């Protein structure tokens, strides 16, 4: 009934850097071949969406940002085979074309069809489905979820359980999957292991959850904010450490605590000093450190390569290591089968029109995750 | 007949830093409990032995250095079960006590009984078996192979094929195993893969050999010295690249050459810039870079953590990843079963008394490996 026609709707457009989002009436073109138009039901606010505002995640402006979300398919273009009008879906900010050597690779997930490396802010065909009073508006990571309606390429969407609570499983579009995958997939945490998690916001809590699912015996939470500790223990942390309580460097504290270094450490805050710290506190011979967050305006870090020469392994990933379209549905299936709870991560829920408020909660540190509802 | 008594023999003592070795008459005490006295048959000259001379590998002086070697057991102390008078043996500069959590760990090989981390320059019991005119002389890495005779702890020795040519299989004590393991064990090079090897001295040639054994489809040799290229191709390299031939940075050249990055890269030269280069030239999503050499007087390197956030894996090891006592005999068995040739690495052979000459060949770059014969 709206199929094949322009939809007039509201979206949160960022017209310029360092400005609040403007709720604007926009037009959303019908989906072309192999494109999918989605009515949004919920979208989380992620740190990476704010990097667009700060200018640190360089991408074309004006933009409709947002990339952690869920909704319902409104319609499909020619040749779409993987979703149908009515399906519950999660947009995939990391695509899975299934053809490139990354998608072919049994370990790789950073599909070369991504728009993160060298952002164009378009659909795969190099155009935009968005206008604001006839002006073109750029897409973001092929998702653009801060809109009542969006069009994504088929390679950027996954069909999920028709019975999922979208207001919750939207977290699987970024924050949860990223954390949880870091443990379960990238690091491959083993049973009886000792883990250390640097940063206890939403993505850190999700690492803790993955470490617990993997059967870690000790999960050491590390953050300078004490108030973060209760929820960390509530989701699986055995102990919590505030570095400001100590007179010695924190990697020494953690090495002592773990009788000569942890099995797996995770940097989830995105700071250069804590990255090196995290690597050092893991056991010199067989320790693994995983880099989860970054600052997209990153300087270089400075590290001593002897930390690696003893036998350490240092690594990062995007989207928790997960091949996106393959994994998103099983993660929802797991939630549905109650293998893990998402409610501990949701601290604030706001209507979409109060997006700017939600970003204030994010910028201030007062929320773990704000979910916006359409 | 010498069992249980002091042996008077010659050794190459370094009395002070930055000095030539002095061939001195020394006394070698009989082995105590769980110690093994070995008559040396051959010893290679390694870059790490020279780091002792430069003062960059800090270890107590005066010292008898050397750690890549083979010989014949002269006698055994009380309770030695793993070798017997007459056995052909390789001293293990990385021990395998078999008890510590590293030796227990299915991936780790840097046994915590090592004397590399915080060198004491003793036997495990904290004493020395060496005197020079009654002055005590320090051990080195529990091996001290620049001596006609040495005493090692049982955890620092492995019994090998009674039919091995010791003049060749001595390379398995460091240089070969380190290179070969880096490919086969640490990186786990896969079939059809594209590999890049930065540095084509002895340890680099050994990486090439491991990559070929693993079934790599492309092995790209990288060195600034053209003269090194023939022997690289002779042992398995498909192509060779001199960065001085190019007008653009070498990681760009290698990324282009490999259609968007190599599967596995290896830094074998020990330079901070080439370490970062090596990591960058591997494929962003599933690339692995392995650090093989170091400079023990190392500054920090400077790198951008975004290189890891895409999906790269960065790692180092000691002794090629190999659990030493477990692996040394099978590596000799493999040589004996002709699964790989060691003669391509041996460019110079000298009597032990011309040790200083051999180090000159090493310092100058004129040899790939000098073997000293007793
Ligand atoms: C934690 C860490 C990273 C990211 C991320 C990176 C790129 C694009 C979008 N989100 N999100 C949460
Ligand atoms: C290549 C790279 C490293 C080493 C090494 C390191 C520590 C002690 C001894 N040898 N040898 C050859
Ligand atoms: Zn792909
Ligand atoms: Zn995100
Ligand atoms: Zn051990
Ligand atoms: Zn060596």
Q: How far apart are CA A322 and CA B352, in angstroms?
A: 56
Distance CA B81, CA B70 (A): 19
Cβ-based neighbour number of residue A126 at 10 Å: 7
Angle separating helix axes B272-281 and B250-257, nearest 10 degrees = 20
Calpha distance B8→B27 (Å, rounded): 5
The token duo for B94 is: 């990385």
Instruction: Give, using CA atoms, the residue closest to atom 10 of ligand 2.
Output: B48
Question: B305, A272: Cβ pair inside 8 Å?
Answer: yes
Is residue B282 annotated as a catalytic residue, yes or no? no
Q: What is the DSSP string of B88-100?
A: EEEE-SS---S-S
In angstroms, this model's resolution equals: 1.9
According to DSSP, the β-strands at B370-373 and B301-303 are unpaired
- CA of residue B174 to ligand 6 center, whole Å: 5
The verdict on the CB of residue B194 being under 6 Å from ligand 2 is no
CATH number of the A1-178+318-374 domain: 3.90.180.10
Give the position of tokens 């883990």.
A195
Quote the CATH superfamily of domain B179-317. NAD(P)-binding Rossmann-like Domain (3.40.50.720)
Answer whether A112 sits within 8 Å of B310, measured CB to CB.
no
Pair of tokens at residue B275: 């370490």
CB of B174 closer than 6 angstroms to any ligand 2 atom? yes
CB contact at 8 A, A115 and A138: no
Tell me whether residues A304 and B313 touch, CB distance under 8 A: no
Q: Shortest CA distance to B44 belongs to which of B198, B221, B203?
A: B203
Give B30's DSSP letter.
P
Q: Residue B38: enclosing H or E segment and its boundaries?
A: strand B35-44
Cα A351 to Cα A305: distance, rounded to the nearest angstrom: 49
Alpha-carbon span A264 to A217, nearest angstrom: 12
Return all residues near B43 (Cβ < 8 A) that are at least 6 apart.
B66, B68, B69, B70, B145, B146, B170, B352, B371, B372, B374
Token pair for residue B38? 């070995």
CA of A178 to the centre of ligand 1 (A): 7
Which residues from chain B sit within 8 angstroms of residue A178, using beta carbons? none
Residues from chain A that touch B102, judged by Cβ atoms under 8 A, are 285-286
Name, in order, each residue with C-beta under 8 angstroms of B246's C-beta and a sequence gap of 6 or more. B253
How many angstroms separate the alpha carbon of residue B241 from the centre of ligand 1?
37
Residue with tokens 């042996």: B7
Q: Is B48 a catalytic residue?
A: yes
CB B123 within 8 Å of CB B15:
no
Burial class (CB in 10 A: 0-12, 13-18, 19+), B112: middle
**Residue A83 Ramachandran class (φ > 0 left, ψ -120 to 50 alpha, else beta):** beta
CB count within 10 Å of CB A259 equals: 10
β-bridge partners, A28: A7, A130
Residue A336, token pair as written in the block: 């549905």
3 state DSSP class of B320: helix
Structural tokens at position B106: 């299915």
Please answer yes or no on whether B310 and A285 come within 8 Å at the CB atom: no
Q: Within a 13 Å sphere around the CA of A326, how many CA atoms are in the beta-carbon half? A: 15
Domain ranges of chain B: 1-178+318-374, 179-317
- B107 vs A contacts (CB less than 8 Å): 286, 311
User: Which residue, among A275, A311, A313, A309, has the nearest Cα to A291 in the 3D structure?
Assistant: A275
Q: Which 3 state secondary structure label does DSSP give B355?
A: helix
CA proximity to B14, closest of B119, B139, B127, B124: B139
Q: Which ligand is nearest to the CA of A119?
A: 1
The reply to whether ligand 1 has any atom less than 6 angstroms from the CB of A194 is no
A211 is catalytic: no
How would you write chain A as a 3-class SS string?
CCCCCCEEEEEEEECCCCCCCEEEEEEECCCCCCEEEEEEEEEECCHHHHHHHHCCCCCCCCEECCCCEEEEEEEECCCCCCCCCCCEEEECCCCCCCCCHHHHCCCCCCCCCCCCCCCCCCCCCCCCCEEECCEEEECCCCCCCCECEEEEEHHHEEECCCCCCHHHHHHHHCHHHHHHHHHHHHHCCCCCCEEEEECCCHHHHHHHHHHHHCCCCEEEEECCCHHHHHHHHHCCCCEEECHHHCCCCHHHHHHHHCCCCECEEEECCCCHHHHHHHHHHECCCCCEEEECCCCCCCCCEEECCHHHHCCCEEEECCHHHCCHHHHHHHHHHHHHCCCCCCHHHCCEEEEHHHHHHHHHHHHHCCCCCEEEEC
CA distances from B232 to A301, B344, B348, B361, B368 (A): 34, 9, 17, 19, 11
């Amino acid at each position: 009934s709206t199929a094949g026609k322009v939809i007039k709707c509201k979206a949160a457009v960022l017209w310029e850097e360092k400005k609040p989002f403007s709720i604007e009436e926009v037009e959303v073109a019908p989906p072309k071949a192999h494109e999918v138009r989605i009515k949004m039901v919920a979208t989380g606010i992620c740190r990476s969406d704010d990097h667009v505002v700060s200018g640190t995640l360089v991408t074309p402006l004006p933009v409709i940002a947002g990339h952690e979300a869920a909704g319902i398919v409104e319609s499909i273009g020619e040749g779409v085979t993987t979703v149908r009008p009515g399906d519950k879906v999660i947009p995939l900010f990391t695509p899975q074309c299934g053809k490139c050597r990354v998608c072919k690779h049994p370990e790789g997930n950073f599909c070369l069809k991504n728009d993160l490396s060298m952002p164009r802010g378009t659909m795969q065909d190099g155009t935009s489905r968005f206008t604001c009073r006839g002006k073109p508006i750029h897409h973001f990571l092929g998702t653009s979820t801060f809109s009542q309606y969006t069009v994504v390429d088929e390679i950027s969407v996954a069909k999920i359980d028709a019975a999922s609570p979208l207001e919750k499983v939207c977290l699987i579009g970024c924050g949860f999957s990223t954390g949880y995958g870091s443990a379960v997939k990238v690091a491959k945490v083993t049973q009886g292991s000792t883990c250390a998690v640097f940063g206890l916001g939403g993505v850190g809590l999700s690492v803790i959850m993955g470490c617990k699912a993997a059967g870690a015996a000790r999960i050491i939470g590390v953050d300078i904010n004490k108030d973060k500790f209760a929820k960390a223990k509530e989701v699986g942390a055995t102990e919590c450490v505030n570095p400001q309580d100590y007179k010695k460097p924190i990697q020494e504290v953690l090495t002592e605590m773990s009788n000569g270094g942890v099995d797996f450490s995770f940097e989830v805050i995105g700071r250069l000093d804590t990255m090196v710290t995290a690597l050092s506190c893991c056991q010199e011979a067989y320790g693994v450190s995983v880099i989860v967050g970054v600052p997209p305006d990153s300087q270089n870090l400075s590290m001593n390569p002897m930390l690696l020469l003893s036998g350490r392994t240092w690594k990062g990933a995007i989207f928790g290591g997960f091949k996106s379209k393959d994994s998103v549905p099983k993660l929802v299936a797991d939630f549905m089968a109650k293998k893990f709870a998402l409610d501990p991560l949701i601290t604030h829920v706001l209507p979409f029109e109060k997006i700017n408020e939600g970003f204030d909660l994010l910028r201030s540190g007062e929320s773990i995750r704000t979910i916006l509802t359409f």
